[PDB]
RNA sequence: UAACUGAAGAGUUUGAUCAUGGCUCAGAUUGAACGCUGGCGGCAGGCUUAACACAUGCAAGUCGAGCGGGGGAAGGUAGCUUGCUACCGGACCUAGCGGCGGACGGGUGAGUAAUGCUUAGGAAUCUGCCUAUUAGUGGGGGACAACAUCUCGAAAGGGAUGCUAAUACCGCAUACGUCCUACGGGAGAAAGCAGGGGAUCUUCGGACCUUGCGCUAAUAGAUGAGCCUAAGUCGGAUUAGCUAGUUGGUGGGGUAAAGGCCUACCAAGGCGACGAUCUGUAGCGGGUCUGAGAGGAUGAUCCGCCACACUGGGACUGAGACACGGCCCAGACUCCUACGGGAGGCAGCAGUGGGGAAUAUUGGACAAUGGGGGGAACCCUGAUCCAGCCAUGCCGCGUGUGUGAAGAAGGCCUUAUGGUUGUAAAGCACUUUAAGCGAGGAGGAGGCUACUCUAGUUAAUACCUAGGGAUAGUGGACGUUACUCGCAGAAUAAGCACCGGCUAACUCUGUGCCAGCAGCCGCGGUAAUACAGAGGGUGCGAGCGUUAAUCGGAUUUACUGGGCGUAAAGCGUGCGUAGGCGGCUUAUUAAGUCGGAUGUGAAAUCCCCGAGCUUAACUUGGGAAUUGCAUUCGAUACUGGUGAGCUAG
């Protein structure tokens, strides 16, 4: 970087970079243990996962983490899948 | 309110889907002959309906695949 | 540019008086070597000539008795064929709508070139301003005066007394006491003389 | 946003400024959405100094596009006029 | 009113001739170059080649009214070596955190024959700042730069320990809208700062009231962007078969959003002689040049779209980038060095080297129009507005005007005395554009500040916002502006090509198939109007010629608009595939064909009538035009489709 300005810029990306990071790898480990427990086939187990997934989801969607659209895809399609284990 | 376009069938084997051969007829920019044209289009048809050799209707839509934009509307004459 | 130099070798080339010089002594006391032209190979009048030399000829002798160059007369001669009319009279117009010219019909300048000379150094005045382009056209129901520093001259007096001797055109309307004027229309192609042919001109622009 | 602004053409030292109702992104003499008058600082004679269609200025003012300052006084001394 | 009005030939094959057929010429045009020459102004244009390599300066900052530190000026109080010290409250500045901007503006055309462009439509999307409207802005916590200490390095810059503020960051609370939903319910935000103040209190220094700028959730609008479809968009068959995520489907993943976009299975599909695949070339359009038109050539300067940023591969931040002056990785190259360690990308502006026939200054200002930041004051802006250089182009002006013959001199020719240069020259009388010197002097500046008044908002006359008035200050880089008025004196200002025919303009000397000329036909071998000089003349004129290139003439690829017995040209002859075309009557359809309406066909450009430049170039108002495309409604003679019938093929 050739300007004060533009080290500047960088040096937030940077900061910005690992704290996205940390908040988006939440929300994938979240995800993944109610994917696990739907593939467990208990439907109390998948339920109690998918409630504690979805603030979580929806938490990251309001900081711009991820979209609020990917979110109601994630929330709807979870919950449809825990349904299908009846 | 919709593009629509007849043509003949001229191939079913895909499943839910149909090839339909449109004919146009358009003068030569030069020599002023009356010439035609054909172009093919994949389109939707949900149950199977259609078959080779019919004339069938076909509307713009979304596109349902990567080479499929239309879809049937109905089957004006059967082979 | 203008023309400088001999006119009385360019009236013999054409072989007609070209009115580049005063008056007060008529052409042939004032050459001597008319229907000769300027060269030693110069010849009679009865030399023959082919139809470009003749339209050529025409052209340069419509050329030199208004002071105007080529580029500016092809200029001329566009204008007046895009202008709905007859060509040659709509080029004629334009010849004879031309500052110097009206202010040398005006008898104000003994020569076309006076009345040059008398545009350019600021010595008349256009509805009221003093301009110095010879190439300005006049219009209908225009104003044209001398300035005031520009009377009082023994040339202008000179110039009124020889344009006397002249007949004053219909289309100018000119009070030589307060030397002012107005061109009240453009001259029709009756008024200009006969021995001008056009459609050679128009011919030969038109190849 | 959408401005209101002057775009400059004419001859050098004799500007002629189109009133012209654009993104604020676009180049000043480049892409715009609807011409809506002129102004013409030098006008003399019979020419015209200002034109301003009032009806397309208020209905773009009220989508919520800015007038700049010059065509904001321009507007102001045109509706005085009239 | 008007918007168009348009078409020419010549030379050359032969002892003549007619035809065929090439070659050559007369025109228009240019981002031109070169040769000779060169006064001024206005308006434009200016690396077409090496997307070759780049020294140096500038081209992206701004906000202290978001935040904590840290600096240096003054003042006042105190003391006293007495105008020096030691303290104290206000005014300034900013390295760091933070916000917004840096995705615009500017450059270039390498790549790209379709993921692009043009025209006309479409559905499954997101969108900072702006406008309207709705509901809010409660209460906590843990950190990290700065800073302090240590350490590495000449430095440039690096590394490590301990603190700290916020509109930085994260829980908790609440939720008109919003998301999910099995219709039962469940889930999710935010931040403060500033101006003024009546009453009241003030746990003592603010609360509270009010007005702004902010922040959160959401719905519309506007703007911008993403995606899809159809039809068009350069050659090659001495390139004929191409394709396995390939073509379609299902479950799942993924995206802002449709979709083989990805993945696992199922099936064997998909494209191609209407040119697939491969290959050469190329940014596309509005437009520009030429042409009577149809066509042909072209895609500088202006506008729209696309693509690229030393060469390739990636992602981060963000509303928006896979980002010219940001990051990571790989490659080539270049620079500094104390050898420890570092640095860079002019196809931004100016400029350098190189290449080339050839294309400019390492300039001024943010005054105007815009752009970024800010409440404002104001700061930044090689965009822009200007200036410099170049006859590169277009337009305009000047280099003087009149008179002047028993026709001076001199030159060129000669029948040797005339002719010509020529009114030309001299002489005589006048004028002063432009350039030079002096004086005056618009417009490009709307505004802003000060004063006063009016109206909203409030508890308020304060503050804020919107208006009115007169007056005064202040604000121009161009700039010694345009323009106007005086002074001096013809004073400062003409070249280039050509004269055998095509093609306007002719002789004399010099040379003798030599020297030379030449676009074509051709000239020159002792009287050369064709070579060189001179005189004379012709065409142009601050220009004149040459070379290069496009269209035309060329009906010389012939659609408009050509030919094939002997001039070039009928396959050696049949059969037959794709295709092209196809007898008569009738009903029907409405694809071709024709008509109407509606929408669209950006602006600029071309054309017409006006307007302003002293005229013109040029600028500009309004029209006309954009011959096209799409949708919809009609007509049925002809062609096509379908049904029926007939017999001349
Ligand atoms: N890493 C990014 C480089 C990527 C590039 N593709 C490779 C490259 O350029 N390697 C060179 C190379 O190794 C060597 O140079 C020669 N000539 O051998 C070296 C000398 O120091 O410099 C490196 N270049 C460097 N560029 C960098 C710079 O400016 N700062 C930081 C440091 O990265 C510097 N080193």
New binding site residues.
Partial sequence: ??????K??????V???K???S?RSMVRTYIKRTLSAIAGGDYAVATEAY?KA??VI??MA???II???????????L?????ALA | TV?TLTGKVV?D?????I?VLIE??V?HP???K?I???????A?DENNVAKIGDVVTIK?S????????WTLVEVVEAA | ????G????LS??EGTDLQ???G??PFDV????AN???????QARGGK??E??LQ?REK?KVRRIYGV????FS?YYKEAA?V?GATGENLLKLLESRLDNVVYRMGFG??R??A??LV????IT?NG?????????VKAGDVIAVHE?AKQ???IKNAIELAAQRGIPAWIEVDHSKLEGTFKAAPDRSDLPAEINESLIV?LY?? | ???I??????????????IVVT?????????F?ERIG?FN??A????EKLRLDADRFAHWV???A?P????A?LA??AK?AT
């Fill in positions: 970087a050739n300007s004060a300005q533009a500047k810029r960088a040096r937030q990306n900061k910005a970079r704290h996205n990071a908040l409630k979805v603030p929806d938490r309001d900081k711009g979209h609020k659209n990917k979110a109601a895809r994630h929330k709807s399609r919950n449809a899948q825990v349904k | 593009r191939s084997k895909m499943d839910k889907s090839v146009r007829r003068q030069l020599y002023g009356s035609r044209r054909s172009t093919k289009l994949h939707h713009e979304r596109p349902i695949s990567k080479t499929k934009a | 540019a203008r023309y400088i001999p006119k009385c070798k013999r080339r580049l010089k005063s007060v002594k004032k050459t001597k070597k000769k032209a300027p060269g030693q190979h110069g000539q082919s470009y030399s050529l340069q160059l080529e580029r500016q200029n895009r709905k003994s020569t070139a006076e040059r000379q350019s150094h600021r010595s256009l301003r003093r301009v110095n382009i010879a190439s300005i056209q520093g001259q023994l040339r011919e038109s190849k | 946003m959408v401005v602004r002057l775009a400059r053409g004419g001859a050098k030292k004799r500007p002629f400024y189109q993104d604020s992104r676009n180049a000043r003499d480049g892409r959405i002129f600082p030098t003399q004679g019979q020419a009220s989508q919520g800015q700049s300052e010059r065509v006084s102001a001394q005085k």
